[PDB]
Structures are given as structure tokens and as C-alpha cells.
């Protein structure tokens, strides 16, 4: 069934200040959360060209703490320059570099963040050519590239359906979706309309990873703003066996004296109550 | 690491579950040899655990209080927190625990932390 | 490093004294390429220093704004603060200085610091 | 004349948390303070057996920031054990290890802290045998071992005179005194009686380093509790050419948001006003 | 049954010149030889005080190449000084340091080489006190200390019987024997008399590791000077399940152009033919 | 490493056994980019294995000849031998094998080695 | 006057096998040869993206052995691909990367090897556009780019005159010549005609570094195939103050038991006899 | 390093020139403690230099024979050659020198090398 882990973005206010990479690995090991999600532009040293010594250290860390590298978070920075947009070839070269790096660190899923052109979060007009230029390498290396479905997007809206039509047209097994649980938030944007858990059912074949986003955990180890119970039961009743990765985005992350590890421990107590 | 003496990272049960562990950083401006450490008594949720149920892992090596008392060659650096492994059959229960550990050195700290089964 | 964006370490005059320098950490959860940086205007003790008088040293290499604008291969990591070298003949005077530097990135900070001659 | 520097003990609340060793070196470089005082049990990695790679990194740091290694702070831990006291041979072996390490890092002075047996800070009964067992090596390597004269001790009291009589008896050039400026504090212990600056004059031949201790710097860059002007003028008029090393011991070092670097910058603005 | 491995002493002419530690691990991985025997004074960096980084690198190497650390080769250097012999306490402290290091690197057996006083290879008169001072730590850490039985000693002679009487008297499970196969050599010292394989049968309860010493491997993958078939069948018929560690001592190790890896590959082809 | 171009370390079968692998060091005084490599034909015990059955692992990443032909950003250092993975179902038999591999670079080696099953 | 050094190409048969970078630095330090010439594609670790740690190690090595980084040897690989030639922009980007790296390691001269299209060693048709695209950066950073003048080219031939006309047209101070002394060889190619030393006189304004190539040193510390005395006297009489860098290219470099350090020591004994 | 016991790298005069130095690797399969070393007599061009004129630098620290005789805690690794500093006022002359150094260890090497002034 669904496994669990942590997205190191939850340690964004701690990483490099009070937490090293090994401290984050040991923190994950404390909760029994063995799926890890890293951001390529944050957690890889000398990125985008890490040394062999750093890669061996990464593998030692993964072995020491029983960490499973699940999701490699990267960006397709087509708007990286200000004077122009990157050609398709440049974006494909950057994406292939990130694919080779993700595979070299043991990751199986890649959370590719595409650049948007509208405020409906529509991807660049050539996102299909970039993805199709990168798909042979991702297939040879066994990597699944997955754009994130985040608020305010809807599991029924046009963005999800464009991605799903692309998947059906190419017949690809290395391109899917990463569902952020914010699309289920029901306790507080004009374009946002809460999805019901069942709305994730026709997408589960293409869902390869999920961001177990939470907003506030109570001292009774309950999430207060998202129907976590119904969502997780829907996923585990319909044959989802990817990971749920805890991702905390609360502003109080940057408050003086905040312990994000305790919030993730509460969230994973909840996820243990739900998954078993 | 953290400002607190008791570190939040590394607080977990030890597996059969034989006890638990937690990390303490040296609250001192210089490192000490293990013979200078005076381990005290642990209080988890008001329950007292005595000095003999706790071993100290420093530099990847585990020491009893008897072994530490005569060890003036092994150095505890201020930047490498010691792991303290407490023998407590069945380990700790899931949820919140109020740790209170006291120790000294020659020439008491509180912490509320979460356990996940 | 520090919590503030403008780091207190590395704030000094540049030697003949051609100006001064200060360090800024990236206030972002991911690293950026140099082409994403939008350097703004420095205000030292209310005196405005424009963008052209400031170069950015990243990964030990110095870049102008013109060079950074087209550099999407050099990566500014969040853990390695950039050095900003400001051309100001005679440098800063000894004592307190109120720095106010603003910059952005694509997809303003205050500091009171001391100069020693 | 007298040079200046910093004792990294002033960064005790920052070192290993927000300041690395290189950050401390760059902080010293900002103030133009080029004398450095380190504590062996704090700032040497894998102490007491640092690798060759770490020593080469130390030399690169010293060259990069124009740092002069002045004083190597170590302890004669004769009471390191609880069941007994170390024999003279064990203490001499520890001291020789520290001497070889101090010389290997370029230090010329060693601040040896002796263990005390009374509350008059009298050293152990065999401190002379330890020092005399270590003196041949310190002489071969060019190291000067210096116990610190701190409050409440008096520049006229029995401790300073025991050290001076030892120096005169052995005729040694590798054993002297490190004077802490707290013996001059006049603005607030029963046994303490403020020395006047002139009291340092008959000791200057044996003074090899001084701790420029300060208690509070004002925003006018003045020390408020120690006659720094008279003290420094006395030292520089009588041919002192060792270092004055800023040492901040204030409890507010551990306060949330305290910037000890700014306090050291004020202190060194003062020392620049005085030394020139 | 009996497993196999390599003693890195076979790479003594290559280690540090053309072979790193990782090259030796990969060489073992080529042959499928997963037991490793290291010498503490050779293969541990910054010995006897390796850094945590080096230990993590060692564990990464063991995981990457599926290496099992079997035997940690160390010496009880009681004659390390020339003016005197080490006291029992000094030898026990050195042995405890080696025990803690062996356990920290994952080794289960320690090949303790005792210093000899006669030419019958009789150990120092206080070897029992050294071993008994080290036995509590070896037992707590799960380490088995084993002196090597080498030529010209006899599996029936007085040395083996002194060790066996010690084992029976103390009733210890952390002290045994390491049998070098040279005691079976039958194809070429006055005191040497070839043992027959059956002579190893009354010792197998106390044998924790064996040095699969060979002298010359033929291109038909046969050892020509030792009855390897009878020896290995005797061990595997009587419930030996320790390791056989290939150890090549031939002088041609230091010949220009010698490939000791090919000789070990021949020896392990033989050991695979025998063990299966 | 070794003097020979074909290294003796790393010569083994690849596991179901899909082929084997061997290491080649760059016989050149400078490193080359992968686009400069011209992989040739392998001859194991006189049996010819063509260029398409061999991939090159460099810097821990595997490349086909098609991928290498357009790769002028990945650098093959002279001190880090390339791994060559040959597709040969069932792998090599135990015992001696005479490898003869030829390749060039823009601006043939022999070896007798042992396989252990 | 002219200084001396070594081009690490002379250690091409030793580097990475029996000599590390630090051994090469210490070898240079033995001869008093303080100018160093490195090849970017050989001696920089993780090239073309070395870590900050490696750069600090390089600076520690330069300080420890009093090495002066003189010449950074790089290649303009326009024919790096087989299907096409690199555009001018790609070559300029590679050259700018090499310029920034050369400046970051302290080098002042860059030996840019241009790709040739004829057998007269004529550079690519767009070498001027590449050099002119790189010249602003080389000028800002204080780097002098210099193509090597090697056999069979002539100091009077068309190649040298094209480079000199380019220098005069652009009026640049960051583009010059690196003269290899093989153009003076007189003791043994059809197109080769030995230059006389005076032929270097009209080029000395543009000569920024020279390769002190030698072919055979005699046990009397004399070069037998090149008029070294006349050449060096011509250079030092006409105000040359760059470096002469010993470069050994003899095939016996790869002979078993060859000591290239002793040959360089003979060559530098000669250069000391000549320079003083 | 090299196959020979006396290394060619590091053979130079020591500066006023107080003598010279050379490197010797440990000709042994395991490292030894300094107390196990028995330094012998140096012969440079047939001229005998006795044991007292030679100090041993190991792990960056210099030891006399008296200091080494009682040092069973400092370890000489086989991969880190010892530096031997010979007191010889005026150092060695430029040109060829035939070194012959003998030493042993508890439980003689030749070399022709060049000096450059």
C-alpha cells in the first residue's frame, strides 16, 4: 500500500543553518519515514556537478538511515533568462542533466516544475517538446517525470486533462502526475474549488507520487484543514502504492524557536494511524 | 545542531525494543575527556531512570559509566553530540514525552519531544 | 551563516581603498542561476549607490550585472552567500553604517554594521 | 609595539552553531585583528589527533586571512580522572602532545591552564616537574608556555611570584606569563584588589601574551570598567611587543540575537585608537 | 558452510602504489570473495585514530561491494620499545583500542599477533593477563580474538595446546584460533612436520577463521603444495562455517609486472570448485 | 591504477547474467569530452563484439555511442577509468579470456584476464 | 630577467600513477623552479567544475611550495564534435569558462591550443571571432591568451604573422605568443627550417611565455640539440622577463624505470647556469 | 610514491644552508610505531654521516632518535614517507650524489640523485 516519507522542503528554514543533510536523514529515520524528496537546487552540493565523493556520501547516508530516494524535485527553467526564453534544446539538455543526476542518486520519480505563462498555471507552449526530448533518457534510466498538481488547479480542470491526454497520446510510462493534497483543502483564492477524494480515482493510474501537504496538526495528531482520512482511504482502496511525502509550508516555519521536526512527527503519527 | 542541550534529532526507540535513545550536546565552550563527564539521572515523564541504565555513544563507540570513569584519552567534542542509549524494555510509547536529563563535568536540561512507534 | 540576509562577516573596505564589500545570503528555499538574480540599489547611511557600482562574487568568480544577466549556467547555492563589492573611492568611514540593500529573483534588507579602518 | 588579535573564546556561543572556523578567521580579518588565540579542545578537528588534511586547511586559512597564530590555549588536566591524579609522566606526555600540535599549527605561545588545589588558585604541587619535563621540547620547537594570570590573583600576590621565581631559577626563555586585563578592573570577590597599570612593569620581561579582556564597550568605542588607556600606554612605553587578544566573557554572549562580532569590532576600534 | 574471502596482505606490494582501498574492495568483488581481512597498521587511515568521515567511507565501501569485514589483523606490540617491555596495562589499553576499532568497522574476528620470546613462537609470559584484561570488552562488543597458528607450529604442539587449555580454563567464547594452512604444506625448517587434515578436527570448535594460504596456483586452478581438497573437505564435513581467507606470501609479489589479483582469482576459482 | 589500458580490476560478469564489463583508462595526457571518444570493436577470445553491444559508464553515468557522440560537456578524466559494459547473454565463461579492445579519440590494446563465475 | 619553471606535461607518464599534484609541486620546489604550467584537462579535479575545497587546496599547495602559476594550458575544442563544428558562441563560452578558471587559480597566461584545418597548422577560420569574444573577459581578469608556436612553424612564417597582425590590429595586451623552443632545434619534417635565436627578437614584445623544450640533456648538464645558450642570451638581452618552462616530450618518458624528475633537474641546472 | 625506499622527490638542501633532506618510505607491509624504528648511518658520496646528525619528520612532526626511541604512540604509515633532515653545514653541492642509507625496524638502500643549488 501507500508508503510515507518527507519532502526536505519542510526543513527549508533549518537546512544549512541548524540542520545538515545527515540531520535531515536522521530526522526522517526517527519518524520511520523512509521516503525522501529532495530539491536539486538545494540539497546537492556543487550542483549541478556534484563530485563522486559527495555521491558516495549520499549513498552512505541513504544506507545508514534506510532512506529510500523517492522524488527528485527539479525545475524546467525556461524563463531562467530575462532577455529571451530557452530553446527547446537547452531545456532538454538541462532536463537530461537532472534526469541523469536523479538516477545517479537512486531516485525513481522526478517532480518537474514547469514554468507557467498564464495564471491558470498553464505550462509553456513547448512543454510537450521538452518532455518528449527527455522521455527516451528517462525511460532508459527508469525515471518517471511528474509535474505537480497544486492549488488552485483542479483534478477536473484543463491542466490535469492536458497532462492526461499527453500521457494517453504518447502511451508513456515515464510521465505522470504528482498530486499535492492542497487540492483537497476544505478549511481556510477565487479559482480554487475543493476536490472531493473520489476525484483522485480516475487519475490514480498516472499518479506516481503525492505531496502529503498539511497546514496545521493538532496535539491530538489530527490534520484540521484536509480530509486526510477519506483521501488516504481512497488512495489505498484503489491500489495506490506510491509515497505520501509530508510537506509543511506554514509561514511559522521561519518563526524563532519553531520545531518543524515535531510537526512532521505529529503528521507521521497521523499517517501511521491511517496507513498502518 | 540546536541551541538546546537535548537534541530533538535522534530521539527514538531502540530495536525487540530494548529501550530508547536521545542526543545531548556538550553545554561547554571546550571539549572534555570522557573521564570528566559525570552522568546523572534521567527523568522521562517524571519516571526516574538511573545512571546504570544509560550508556554513552561518543565517536561511534559505546561506553558505560564504569568505562567512561577511567577514559581520559577519548575526547568529546562540543560539535558532536553524544548519543545516550537508555535500557527500557518496551521502549517509549507514541506521543509526547517530557525528558529531564542532568549531567555535569569536572575541571539539568528539559525537553518535550515526540516518539513515533 | 546567519539569519539575516546581509551577513555581518565580510563587511570591510577593499584595498588604495577602492570601495567596500558585504555578504548577502540567498533568502530563498532553492538556489538560483545568476540570470535569475535582479540586483537592486544599495543605500549606505541613506546615500544611494546604484546597481552599476556593485559586482557579485559567486563561487569565487566576480560578475557584473551585464555578465549575470546572461548566465544561466552558474548556480548560486543558498548555503554560500554572495560577496558584493561596491566601488566607492575611499571606502567607508570607521564606525556604524546602516546598510539597506534590495534585490530580487525571478522564477529589501536592513543591517547596522561596524567598519574598522 | 603591541599588536592585536582575538581569542576565539569570544565566539564560544557562535562557534559550531552559526560560525565555522573560516567565519571566525574572516571576522578577525574584517577588524584587521591578525593575532588569533584558539582553544585546543574546541577549534581543532579530531583533537587531539588532527589529520594532515585538516592541518593543511588550517594553514590555508591562516594564509588567506593573514592570520598570525599567537596563542594556543590548552589545559594541564591533572585532575582529568576522578579516582586519582595523573602522574607527572602522564601530564608531561599530554603537554608534549599539545606542544607539538601548537608548533605544528604555527603557534608561538601556549596558554597552559594549570589545575588548582586551593581557592587562591595555587597550582598542583608538581606543576614545576610537569613544566620542566615539557621545557626541552618547548625550547627545541620555539614554544613559550604561559599560565594565565586572572582575577582574583594579584600581580603582586604569591602566585605571580612563584611563577617569576621559577623563571629566574630555571633561567628559561620558554616559560612566562599571560596577563588577563581583569586584574586591572576598577568598575563593578573578596580577594580581588585592582592593580594599577604600573604593577605590570616589573613583569613585562616575562609577559609573552595578554588577554585584552573587556566587560562592556560603549557606543563611543570606550571600555567602561578597565583603565585601558593607562594599561596600554604602560605596556607600549615599557617595550611590550606581544599581542593583546580581545576576550569577551559577558553572559549576554548567549543571549538571543547577540552579535559578539560587533562588540569585538568596538573593542578593536578602541585598541586601534590606543595602539595606532 | 565455509565462506571465502581475501586477506589484503596479498596486496602488500600493490597497496598504496597502484591499488587504493576501493580497488582492493572491487578486486574482491570481482572474484565474489566477500570476506575481507585487513591489517590495522596498514589499511586504516590516520591509524590508530581514524576520523568519522573515514569510517563512513569504509562503511560505504563495504556496502557498495558487498564486503563482509571478517578479520581485523592487529599486533600486541609488547616489544614495541627497546629499553623495556610494555606493562600489562599498556598492552591491554592498546588491545582495547584495537578491539573498539575492529568493532567500529564491523569486524567480528581479531587476528591478534602475539610477540614471541623463544623460537618455538612461545608468547610473552603475560599474554594470558593481556588477553584476560581485554576479554570483557571483546565480549561486550562481540569480538573474537584469535592468535594465528602458523608454520612451523604444529596443531599438536605445545603452543596450540596452551591456547586450547586457556580457552577451556576461562570457558571463553571470544578467544579462539586462526589456522594458517601452511601447517598442511607437503611440497617444498627443521621443526616443521606437515599436519594431516584430520589434525584440524579436535580444534574446529575453537577455530573462528582460517588463512587459506597458498604457495603456487597452476593454470589448471590447482594448488600444488597443500592438500587443499582434503583440508577443505575436512573443515566442511565437521561443521566449520567461518571464512577461508586467501593469503599470498610469495616473493614474486614484488616482481615487476606481477598481477597478484590473477593469482587470487585462480585461488578462488579453486575454492569455488571445492566449496560450491 | 595500472599501466595497461585495459584494467584487470572490474573485469566480471554482469547480473540473470546479461553480459560482462571491463575498465579502460584513457591512454592520453589530457582528459577528453565524450564526443571525442571513438569506441571501436571488442574481441574476446577472437570472437568479435561490435560497437553497439558496449556502453560506456563515465562519472557514474552510462552512455551509448549515440549519446556520447553529441556529449561535449561530460569530461573523461585520465585518472578515472571508464567502465565498458558489454551485452553478451550468459556472460563469459570461467577461466582465461584474451581481450582485445580498440578505441580512439579525436583532437588497440590486449589483455589476458581471468573470469570467476 | 627570465624566470624558470616546469610544465607538468613533463610528468605525463607519472601523474596519477606514481606522482600526485603535491608530488609535482614538491618536485618543482626541489629544483627551485617556481613557474608552473598545468593542463586544464589533466590537473584540475572534477574539471571543468572544481569544488571550492579543491581550489583552496590548490592555493595551499601554491603557498606551501612557493609555486607561481604561470601558464594555464587549455584547448579551443571547436572540432570536439564529429557531426559539426561548434558555433562561435559555444567556443567563446568554453573559452570564458577556461579564462575564469585560470584566473581563479592565479594563472596569468593561458596557452590556448587552437584547432587546425590544414597541415600548415592554420587555425580555424573563426579563431579571431572566438578570441575577440573572449578578450573582454581576459582583459577584465588580467589573463593573457597565447597560442603556442611549435614545430614545424617558423617565426617568420604565415602563422606567426597572422597572430602578430591580429595583435597589432586589435591593439590588445591580452593576446600574445607562447614560443616553443623546438623552433630552434638544429640536431636531429620537410616544412621545418631551424630559426636562429635572433629571429625571436621582433616577436619579444608579444611573447608572454616560452616552453623551454629540450630533447636530450647530457650528464654535463648541457642540451645537445638546441642552441640554448644563444637563445636564452638573446631573450635576456632584449628584455624578456616571462618564464621559461621546461617541457620534456621524449618517448622514453614512458620507459620502465625512467626518472623524468632527474632529467628536469639536469635541464634546470642548465637554466641556472644560463640565467643566474 | 615510488618503488625505491629512498624517494627522489624531496631531495634538496635545507636553508643559511644547514644541511639537506631526503624522503624514505617504509619498506614493510605494515606501519610501525616510532619506537620500532632503528635509524642507521647515512653515506653520501662515501662520506659517512652518523645517526645523531639526522632527524625524522613523520606526520609533520620532527623527532630525534632519543625522542623516537620512547615513542610508541606515533605511527609511521607505509603510505606516508618519512622526511630525514641531515645536519650538514653548507648542504650538498650541485650535481649527482650517491646516497646509501640503512635503517631497520623491530617486531640498506642506494640511490643516485641530483641536487640543484
Author numbering:
A (entry chain G), D (entry chain E), E (entry chain A), G (entry chain C): 8 to 195, 202 to 289
B (entry chain H), C (entry chain F), F (entry chain B), H (entry chain D): 1 to 15, 20 to 111, 139 to 148
Task: Tell me what the authors wrote about this structure, in their words.
Here, we present the identification and structural basis for the activation of xenobiotic C-glycosides by heterocomplex C-deglycosylation enzymes from intestinal and soil bacteria. They are found to be metal-dependent enzymes exhibiting broad substrate specificity toward C-glycosides. DgpA catalyzes the oxidation of the glucoside moiety of puerarin to generate 3”-oxo-puerarin, in which the 3”-oxo-sugar moiety is cleaved by an unusual C-deglycosylation enzyme complex, which is an α4β4 heterooctamer of DgpB-C, to produce daidzein. For clarity, the DgpB-C and DfgA-B complexes are referred to as PuCGD and EuCGD, respectively.
Expectedly, our studies, such as co-expression, purification, and SEC-MALS analysis of DfgA and DfgB, revealed that DfgA-B formed an α4β4 heterooctamer in solution, as in the case of DgpB-C. To obtain more structural details of C-deglycosylation enzymes, and to examine the flexibility of the lid-domain and the loop regions in PuCGD and EuCGD, we also determined the structures of PuCGD and EuCGD at 2.85 and 2.54 Å resolution, respectively, using single-particle cryo-EM. The α4β4 heterooctamer structures of both enzymes were almost identical to those of the X-ray crystal structures (RMSD values 0.6 and 0.4 Å, respectively). Intriguingly, however, the densities of the lid domain in PuCGDα and the long loops in EuCGD were disordered in the cryo-EM structures. These results suggested that open-to-closed conformational changes of the lid domain occurred upon substrate binding. Although the EuCGD complex did not possess a lid domain, the disordered loop regions would play a similar role in the active site formation. In contrast, EuCGD acted on C6-glycosylated compounds 3-5, but not on C8-glycosylated compounds 1 and 2.
